[PDB]
Symmetry: C7
Subunit: 96 residues, 7 copies
Amino acid sequence: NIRPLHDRVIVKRKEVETKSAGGIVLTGSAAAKSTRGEVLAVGNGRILENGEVKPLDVKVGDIVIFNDGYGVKSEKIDNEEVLIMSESDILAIVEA
Amino acid sequence: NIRPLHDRVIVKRKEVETKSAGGIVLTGSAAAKSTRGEVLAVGNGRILENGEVKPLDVKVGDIVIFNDGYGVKSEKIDNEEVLIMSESDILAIVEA
Amino acid sequence: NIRPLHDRVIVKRKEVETKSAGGIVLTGSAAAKSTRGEVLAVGNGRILENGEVKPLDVKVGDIVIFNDGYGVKSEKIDNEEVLIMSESDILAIVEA
Amino acid sequence: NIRPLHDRVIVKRKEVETKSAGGIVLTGSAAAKSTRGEVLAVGNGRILENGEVKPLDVKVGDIVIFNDGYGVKSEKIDNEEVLIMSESDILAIVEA
Amino acid sequence: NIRPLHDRVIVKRKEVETKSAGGIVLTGSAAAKSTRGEVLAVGNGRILENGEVKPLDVKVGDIVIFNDGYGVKSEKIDNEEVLIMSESDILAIVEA
Amino acid sequence: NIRPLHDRVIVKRKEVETKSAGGIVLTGSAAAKSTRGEVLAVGNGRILENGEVKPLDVKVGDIVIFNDGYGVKSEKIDNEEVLIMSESDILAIVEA
Amino acid sequence: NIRPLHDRVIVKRKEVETKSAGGIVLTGSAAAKSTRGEVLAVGNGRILENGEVKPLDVKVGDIVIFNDGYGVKSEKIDNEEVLIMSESDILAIVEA
């Protein structure tokens, strides 16, 4: 089990859409890596300058739309790929 | 349904003006993508250093003039293009 | 009608001086774009870190000497060009 | 009349020294533009984070040694050149 | 013995996996340096702007997934290699 | 007379050592410009966020070690060269 | 005698190990400059934004592992080389 520290989130990226809306199969770079993924673990919370810990608004098990960049990192836990990213890199959460 | 986090805003971009003011048809890069778009969703509000959350001055359903850049991000929801951008990237709002 | 957000100003750039001081007509790069323009709209005011919004020192209808750069954006409203710039980009205000 | 806002100063750059100490006339790039100039106008005062405005240490009519760069801007008022620069760009003042 | 100051951690990097999940031996760049390492020493703690020193959330003897970069540094203590990195450079500790 | 503003210091750079410790004459780039120089004038003091002015720890007439760079500026007063540099650019004072 | 101001430390770099663990002599770039050095002088202490001076955690006469970079500087006092570096550039002190 992996749990982050401060404003950091462990997110499992969802599989890229093999088929499009109309039923056509997408292959190669056309079926680009999905930017939404379910949240596996949430850190303790963002640290402020006054010394308090502010809990992250992201909950465990909620699909979130995030951004790939230098902030995000790829890690291998039990032969599975996870993304470690700051809560700021999380653009939004997905509900319903 | 998608809702943003903190200062981020979900905006649907308005369709680029195919027709100019004087009745001439605009095509190609000349009919550039509009910088105005109706706000689809407003985040909980920007977080300050003290720990309080201040609601964003933008409202859901208000057309806003925004800036394209690294901050804004393109996303697909229900087979439709939306932009995720920080409230700072929102230049202004359009009224009347 | 367009009004800005936080510390932003909508300014109407004045026409570039066609003629010089002594009556010489300037054309091309000689009649460079003017850096002074009348303020069309003033935002609510700059937001401080503590959460208080202080009104901008500029006023609607006052000519301001501004700086071109990444901060200023050229938007179009009713086939007319307006510069949206942060109040910091406003170097000075023109009185009398 | 032109006056600045916040921590900005309107300065009139002094004429470059045509002759050196020994009475030799200097021309071209050798007679470089002087970095000293009399202060024409002082802004209201530097903006602080807590919301207070602190008056600038410079005074109108005092010669100041300043630095050229991106901060300083050359504006024309009544066919005369004035430097608009932040108070930080002002290295020092000249007395006696 | 080596101990850090402020928000710095001394970590002993784990050996790179010679064999993969299926017993397939990996060599060269394929068996890249592991981003996990057991924590050897924890500094006194990060210093905030108010002047207080807070303890780090990382405990001595806990494996941490960290990021290699300019912040991390390699040091030779008792003919052994250790990485000195800021607590921010630590991504997530490993439990069970 | 010239005196600085806020966290700035006027220093007179010492003459570059012509002869080394062993009576060997050094010339050209080998006798590089000394980083040591006596303090000629001390500004009013650094300004903090809250609005108070804290006096600089350097004293007038005390030799200091300065780091050349963008911070330091070479001005001329009474045909003599003076370095205007921020107090942060001052490394260490020289006593005895 | 040389002493620093604010968060600065004067450190004498230790001699670079000529021989390795097994008694083999190392020469050239292989015997790289040591990153640990005994502390010769400690500044008054780091200054925070509120105006208080926080004493440095480094004590005089303690060997510290540091980082070479733009922050560190080389100075010649009594025909001897000393590194002037901010306490942030100090990585970790050495005990026993």
